[PDB]
Paper text:
Here, we determine the protein substrate, structure, and mechanism of a type III-E [name]-associated protease (CASP) from the marine anaerobe [name], reveal insight into its natural function in coordinating a transcriptional response to foreign genetic material, and engineer it for novel RNA sensing applications in vitro and in human cells. We identified that the largest protein, [name], is specifically cleaved in response to a target RNA. [name] consists of a three-helix bundle N-terminal domain (NTD), a TPR domain with eight repeats, and a protease region containing a pseudo-caspase (CHAT1) and active-caspase (CHAT2) domain that resembles separases. In both complexes, [name].2-[name].4 interface with the NTD, TPR and CHAT1 domains of [name].
By comparing the inactive and active complexes we observed a major structural change within the eighth repeat of the TPR domain, which we term the activation region (AR). The AR is bipartite, composed of AR1 (aa 313–325) and AR2 (aa 356–411), which stack with each other in the inactive state. In the active complex, AR1 senses the 3’ end of target RNA (position −4 and −5) through base stacking interactions and pushes the AR2 helices away, preventing a steric clash. The target RNA in our active complex is non-complementary to the direct repeat (DR) and the structure reveals that this is an important feature. In the active complex, the kinked target RNA site at position −2 is stabilized by base stacking interactions, provided by both [name]–11-Y718 and [name]-Y398 within AR2. Prominent salt bridges formed between R394-E672 and D395-R625 help position the loop containing the catalytic C658, and the strand containing the catalytic H615, respectively. We note the similarity of this mechanism to eukaryotic caspases which are also thought to be regulated by the conformation of the L4 loop containing their catalytic cysteine. Together, these structures reveal an allosteric cascade initiated by the 3’ end of [name], triggering the AR within the [name] TPR domain, and transducing structural changes to the [name] CHAT2 domain to coordinate active site residues. In addition to revealing insight into CASP activation, our active complex also provides structural details regarding the interaction with [name]. One limitation of our structure is that the cleavage loop is mutated (and slightly shortened), and thus, we cannot observe substrate engagement in the active site in detail. As the loop is also flexible, it is not well resolved, but its density places it near the active site of [name] positioning it for cleavage.
Author numbering:
A (entry chain B): 2 to 108, 117 to 251
B (entry chain A): 1298 to 1601
C (entry chain A): 154 to 237, 260 to 319, 326 to 834, 842 to 918, 929 to 992
The structure:
RNA sequence: UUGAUGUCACGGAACCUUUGUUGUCUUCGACAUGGGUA
RNA sequence: UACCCAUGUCGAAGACAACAAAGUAUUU
């Protein structure tokens, strides 16, 4: 891999006002540290960085607290996006490694939201076997809820945090746990938003339909686009709506 | 204005070294990439690859040497009934080297001149007679000088070197650095500048691990390894191997009843009953600043 | 309730929360865990209450109630009977001294060293002096106002701290405070969290379970077994105090600092060994009707006492590290330390079994025989030799509780389960154990090891070096054995280090699908290294103990110095020394010990072949023991094993050319005088490689072996013995003998390494390996108007 | 500070993996100090 | 704001750099 060389290339290009530059620099430095912690074969690289005063000045500027902490959330969000794109081309082992890399890197509302979504997706990988659910599935969903509640304690209108909280609450119910408290109130806020962001939301608006006995949002579902991979699941939601 | 690391080419500085560039490197103390500012951009030189560094274990092991025969001492012991202890010899003052002599001034003209080596000579005969190497006056006890028990010439030792994952050219140049050539010697131990410590090494045997259950005699392959070593030096440096020649001239052992006189000057010629110049006279005569680094880097250049 | 209903600040005022785990039988690794508070009975032995009875209740109901209360023998998880300041001030002062004198870099070392003083206040008088025998040591005389040495001497002489327990408490609190101050300098105390698997798991009972009536019969007997469990190795029952950060791995202790053998561990080990006997794992989950497998039915009759030791000295602290196989150096972050309990501690042991069979079931008789033969492997860290016990002085008898006379006698005495009743019951127990019928051999076998070294040896401990009177930079490992309440020191080679060496020897010469076993990650892996030595997913099948030295040698100290390649003198701060154990060809060091190997490994010819190959290479001298083998320490003369029936040990078994004549010419003039030294000017080009040869295997095409050499003196040689600078006595005039080891004239390996390294550096045109880069030169001005003095202005 | 016709929690080993290790010749010569006289 | 030197004495280095805990599959 030679991650030291990658750090040189980024340090040549990078300027501190530019998101992509800092995203790339943070990514390269994290990969270097990861290879050290793994005792990888890349640890045989004994070389250092060239142009020492320039490299020192640029690294010293990057490691400013606000610069690196800013870059952290953006790198996490970029990885989370690229995961949710390539999720269905990956095998289980490498889906797992991707998500756990995101979690370890991120361990600001952008960071918390990204970490909550990463924990939600890590939990989805576990599947029940026989009449037993893995404990780590419940653990992951509870940690997602815990992260979501930092945002919602100070901004109850935040749609993404609210939706992640509601998804995790529905998975808790699926595992045979109870709903967490104030599920009804938060599920009522979601209906005050009233728009489908992703396929999971269709299952929330049906829960709202069955609870408040309100039919307004069913026409959104019946008009949803058919160009989806999990067509059978969408058709099952269509049947419930009808 | 400069730290001494800036008075030599950056290529000859240690591979894994200290921060000499202008700045306060402690600003990155919390993060792993700080180490990359302390390492050469192109990696490890041969001696670092063979003998190792703080971040890379070495590939050779040096064992203790043991004397083979009954000792032959420089001076007979106080009790003639005991041959296993020798008598004392008193050395003249041992003082620290001064780099300000080799680097005469703040002018950027003056570099680090090179690697120090001590020459071979017999001033130990004067010390055995109890006299100072330069002045010839009797040495006196002081809190600052030493008395030692010293072996004579002709004592023999044996020791072993273990090695692992060497290239053939590496083993060839290691054998070359051990045995040298007939007419050359190493220096070892205390008081090298007073003529003590000339030693010669000879290989007795090389054995090789073929695998976990077979070892084999390697004596037959020694010439091939030496050939590859010298071919490697040609590949790196082509014809311009002058540093080898200067090294050999400093490793040369005087033979044929030759008797070089080797000593440091006195501080002033009035202090020397032989009548040669001291440092205070030399520093504006032969070893004047514009001439000093050339004379010091030319083997066996006389000062008087 | 407690009598008088007193109040406390909270649960932590009365007890400690401890993790209790569940171990998967086949992998040997924990599946999950839960937590509870434990409250010690010596602090809170008693609760009191009332039963209120209506007058119309019959006499027979009253009799049944009273007999039931006497028969009830356990509640809230405990066997029972039913009847009817300085350290803060010192830390602040020492921190002020350190920061006033700009010596804060030593905070961590001081914190660890002061913690080490907790075992005896007399150690304060023993703290090292400087090399001149004077109070200017670089740690203890900082501040030379008062010094640290004076602060500690005053504290040790404070009458409140004269009690050993108070001194231990003082040292521990002070060490923790200095540790936390040292952590601030590194950016604060921060510890990496686990991604997932960090939550407790509680068993869920089943509410749809069906009701059953079961007879079990009137035949019912109780067997009592009494004895001792004796520590034949050091042992480790892990338990972390969350408020104690300084130590990474910690031992379980009572509140008054006695060592504890907990009930939970003993039950877990009994269940494990019973499944080993029957040779069938139990698969049952928590909750639902009780499991009916043969192990669970026995465990439902068993009772065991929680036990503690009379011995209460502080634990040892062991250093531990991990080596990166590619570079041959410590891996990033892999330095940690461990508390260990000494061998020789004795625990009371009492077991009881209730059942309808005529005695102990045959499986339990076999397991107790295994324990009596010294294969009670009870504690954690088994792979590195911790936790082997022998059951000693066993006695037993069976009481028949179907007999009404016996049963009334039993009820009258609460089953003889209190201290006084126990001392009566012991008068009627019979010596020995009941012999098993269907006996099965123990699953582990002992291999005896003996190693011979013809060189010095060190297994370094710098913290012990910081407090020992001798005052070198590093000294060798020692450990302590308990006798009564006395502690005796023994020089040893750590079990962990020896395991590491053997594991490396095995891994470097085997492959899986053409990849060395050193390079694998070992996820979903079935390689022989996982099979023998274990992994992060399953326990290993070979257990290494510490090795001890025969005939108790005494350490020797050697001096060292690094030489600047330009000046030819001592490099600025790099003068140092060590204290290895002396070993030589005439008087070699002898190491003895043993390791335990599971019998299914000895039965497998392939695994035996692998171990044999590795120990053959250790016997050949390719793997030195301990540190600093670059300068000649740790060299194995031979290694031999006994006990395998030769299943492992079956595998363990042209003149040099003339040197050329030199071409060098030097011409000497008889009247001239020459300088004692000259400088070799290097070539401009240094040849570097970004990625040197890795240590993780013997690479094909490269060479490995030994060079044997002859050295001859041409002029007189001085190699001094600097351990004594006054040898020729009839600041003073110093004098030295020639270097000797066990009265043999020798040259150290470090001298030869440095000598040859200088010439090799010059021949290959290498960098100046040793060189004082950061020195700043300066020169005197001269009395010269034009060139100097007219440029300096007021 | 329980609630009562129903508690196998003595129903659960803080267990598992990690080499206090890597690098270093007990060496060795010119240097200190600040004026003085017109 | 030009010129000129004068005196002979003396031990140094005594550990430094790195790591300071990290990991611990539930499945096409
Ligand atoms: Zn180098
Ligand atoms: Zn069972
Ligand atoms: Zn494996």
């Amino acid at each position: 891999s030679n991650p030291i060389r990658d750090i040189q290339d980024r340090l040549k290009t990078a300027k501190f006002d530019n998101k992509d530059d800092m995203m790339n620099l943070a990514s390269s430095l994290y990969k270097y540290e990861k290879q050290l912690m793994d005792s990888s074969e890349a640890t045989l690289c004994q070389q250092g960085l060239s142009n020492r005063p320039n490299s020192f000045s640029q690294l010293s500027q990057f490691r400013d607290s606000d610069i690196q902490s800013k870059a952290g959330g953006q790198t996490g969000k970029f990885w989370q996006n690229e995961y949710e794109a390539c999720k269905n081309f990956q095998t289980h082992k490498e889906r797992r490694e991707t998500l756990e890399q995101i979690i370890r890197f991120l361990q600001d509302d952008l960071l918390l939201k990204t970490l909550a979504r990463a924990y939600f997706h890590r939990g989805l990988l576990y599947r029940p076997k026989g009449f037993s659910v893995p404990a780590r599935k419940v653990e992951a969903m509870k940690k997602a809820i815990a992260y979501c509640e930092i945002i919602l304690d100070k901004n109850e209108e935040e749609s993404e945090a609210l939706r992640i909280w509601l998804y995790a609450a529905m998975e808790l119910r699926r595992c045979g746990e109870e709903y967490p408290e104030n599920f009804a109130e938060k599920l009522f806020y979601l209906a005050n938003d009233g728009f489908i962001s992703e396929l999971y939301d269709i299952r929330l608006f049906l829960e709202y339909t069955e609870r408040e006995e309100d039919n307004n949002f069913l026409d959104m579902i019946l008009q949803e686009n058919q160009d989806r991979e999990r067509l059978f699941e969408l058709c099952l939601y269509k049947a419930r709506a009808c | 204005d400069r730290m001494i690391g800036k008075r030599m080419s950056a290529d000859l500085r240690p591979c894994h070294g200290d921060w000499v560039e202008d700045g306060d490197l402690s600003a990155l103390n919390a993060y792993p990439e700080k180490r990359l500012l302390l390492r050469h951009p192109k990696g490890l030189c041969p001696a670092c690859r063979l003998f190792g560094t703080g971040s890379y274990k070495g590939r050779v092991r040096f064992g203790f040497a043991s004397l083979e025969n009954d000792p032959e001492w420089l001076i007979p012991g106080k009790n003639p009934g005991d041959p296993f202890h020798g008598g004392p010899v008193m050395l003249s003052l041992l003082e620290r080297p001064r780099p300000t002599w080799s680097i005469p001034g703040s002018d950027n003209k003056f570099k680090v001149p090179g690697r120090k080596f001590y020459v071979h000579h017999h001033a130990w005969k004067t010390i055995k007679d109890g006299n100072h190497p330069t002045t010839g006056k009797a040495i006196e006890q002081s809190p600052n000088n030493r008395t030692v028990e010293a072996l004579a010439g002709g004592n023999s030792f044996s020791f072993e070197i273990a090695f692992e994952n060497l290239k053939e050219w590496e083993l060839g140049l290691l054998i070359h650095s051990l045995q040298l050539e007939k007419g050359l010697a190493h220096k070892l131990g205390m008081a090298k500048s007073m003529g003590f410590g000339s030693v010669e090494i000879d290989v007795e045997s090389v054995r090789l691990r073929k695998d976990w259950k077979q070892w084999r005699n390697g004596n037959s392959e020694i010439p091939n390894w030496l050939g590859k070593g010298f071919a490697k030096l040609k590949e790196w440096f082509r014809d311009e191997l002058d540093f080898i020649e200067n090294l050999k001239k400093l490793l040369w052992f005087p033979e044929g009843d030759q008797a070089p006189r080797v000593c440091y000057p006195m501080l002033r010629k009035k202090d020397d009953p032989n009548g040669n110049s001291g440092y205070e006279e030399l520093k504006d005569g032969e070893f004047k600043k514009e001439d000093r680094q050339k004379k010091l880097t030319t083997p066996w250049t006389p000062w008087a | 309730s407690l009598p008088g209903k007193p109040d406390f600040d909270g649960p932590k005022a009365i007890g400690s929360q401890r993790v209790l785990n569940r171990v998967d039988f086949k992998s040997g690794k924990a599946h999950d865990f839960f937590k509870a508070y434990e409250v010690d009975h010596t602090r809170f032995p008693r609760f009191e209450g009332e039963i209120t009875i209506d007058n119309k209740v019959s006499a027979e109901a009253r009799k049944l109630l009273c007999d039931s209360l006497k028969f009830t023998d356990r509640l809230c998880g405990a066997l029972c009977v039913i009847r009817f300041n300085l350290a803060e001030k010192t830390a602040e002062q020492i921190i002020s001294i350190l920061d006033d004198n700009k010596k804060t870099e030593y905070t961590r070392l001081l914190a660890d060293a002061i913690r080490s003083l907790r075992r005896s206040s007399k150690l304060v008088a023993g703290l090292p002096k400087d090399h001149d025998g004077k109070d200017d040591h670089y740690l203890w005389d900082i501040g030379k106002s008062v010094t640290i040495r004076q602060i500690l001497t005053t504290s040790a002489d404070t009458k409140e701290l004269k009690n050993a327990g108070k001194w231990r408490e003082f040292c521990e609190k002070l060490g923790e405070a200095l540790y936390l101050k040292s952590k601030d300098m590194s950016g604060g105390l921060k510890i990496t969290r686990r991604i997932l698997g960090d939550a407790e798991f509680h068993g869920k009972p089943d509410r749809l379970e069906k009701s059953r009536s079961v007879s079990i019969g009137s035949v019912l007997k109780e067997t009592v077994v009494c004895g001792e469990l004796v520590a034949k190795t050091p042992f480790f029952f892990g338990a972390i105090d969350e408020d104690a950060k300084q130590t990474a791995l910690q031992v379980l202790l009572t509140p008054d600092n006695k060592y504890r053998l907990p009930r939970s561990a003993v039950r877990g080990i009994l269940r494990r060994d019973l499944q080993t006997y029957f040779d069938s794992p139990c698969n049952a989950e928590l909750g639902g009707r009780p499991c009916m497998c043969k192990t669970c039915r026995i465990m439902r009759g068993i009772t065991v006492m929680d036990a503690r030791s009379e011995y209460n000295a502080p634990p040892e602290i062991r250093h531990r590290t991990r080596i990166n196989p590619f570079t041959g150096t410590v891996a990033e972050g892999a330095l940690f330390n461990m508390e260990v309990a000494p061998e020789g501690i004795v625990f009371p042991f009492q077991l009881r079994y209730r059942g309808s069979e005529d005695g102990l079931p045959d499986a339990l008789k076999t397991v107790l025989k295994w324990w009596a033969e010294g294969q009670a492997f009870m504690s954690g860290a088994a792979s590195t030799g911790k936790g082997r016990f022998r059951m000693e002085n066993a006695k037993y008898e069976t009481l028949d509780l179907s007999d009404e006379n016996q049963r009334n006698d039993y009820l009258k005495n609460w089953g003889w389960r209190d201290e006084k009743g126990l001392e009566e019951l012991k008068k009627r127990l019979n010596s020995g154990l009941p012999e098993p019928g269907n006996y099965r051999d123990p699953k582990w076998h002992e291999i005896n090891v003996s190693i011979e070294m013809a060189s010095p040896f060190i297994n370094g401990d710098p913290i012990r070096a910081a407090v020992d009177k001798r005052g070198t930079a590093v000294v060798t490992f020692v450990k302590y054995k308990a006798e009564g309440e006395e502690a005796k020191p023994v020089c040893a080679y750590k079990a962990e280090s020896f395991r590491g060496v053997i594991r490396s020897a095995v891994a470097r010469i085997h492959m899986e699908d053409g990849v060395p076993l050193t390079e694998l990650t070992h996820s979903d892996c079935e390689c022989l290294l996982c099979q023998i030595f274990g992994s992060e997913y399953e326990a290993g099948k070979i257990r290494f103990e510490d090795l001890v030295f025969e005939s108790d040698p005494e350490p020797v100290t050697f001096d060292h110095v690094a030489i600047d390649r330009f000046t030819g003198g001592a490099a600025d701060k790099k003068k140092f020394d060590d204290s290895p154990l002396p070993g030589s060809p005439a008087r070699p060091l002898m190491l003895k010990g043993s390791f335990w190997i599971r019998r299914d490994v000895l039965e497998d010819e392939e695994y035996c072949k692998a171990l044999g190959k590795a120990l053959a290479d250790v016997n050949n001298g390719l793997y030195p023991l301990g540190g600093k083998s670059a300068i000649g320490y740790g060299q194995v003369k031979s290694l031999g094993i006994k006990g395998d029936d030769k299943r492992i040990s079956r595998l363990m078994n042209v003149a040099v050319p003339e040197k050329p004549k030199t071409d060098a010419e030097v011409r000497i003039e008889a009247e001239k005088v020459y300088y004692p030294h000259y400088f070799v000017e290097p070539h401009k080009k240094v040849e570097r490689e970004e990625k040197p040869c890795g240590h993780q295997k013997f690479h094909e095409g490269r060479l490995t072996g030994k060079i044997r050499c002859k050295l001859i003196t041409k002029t007189p040689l001085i190699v001094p013995d600097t351990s004594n600078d006054d040898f020729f006595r009839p600041e003073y005039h110093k004098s030295y003998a020639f270097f000797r080891l066990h009265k043999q004239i020798m040259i150290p390996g470090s001298e030869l390494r440095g000598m040859v390294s200088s010439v090799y550096e010059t021949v290959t045109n290498s960098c100046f390996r040793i060189f004082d880069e950061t020195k700043r030169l300066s020169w005197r001005m001269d009395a010269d108007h034009q060139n100097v003095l007219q440029d300096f202005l007021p």
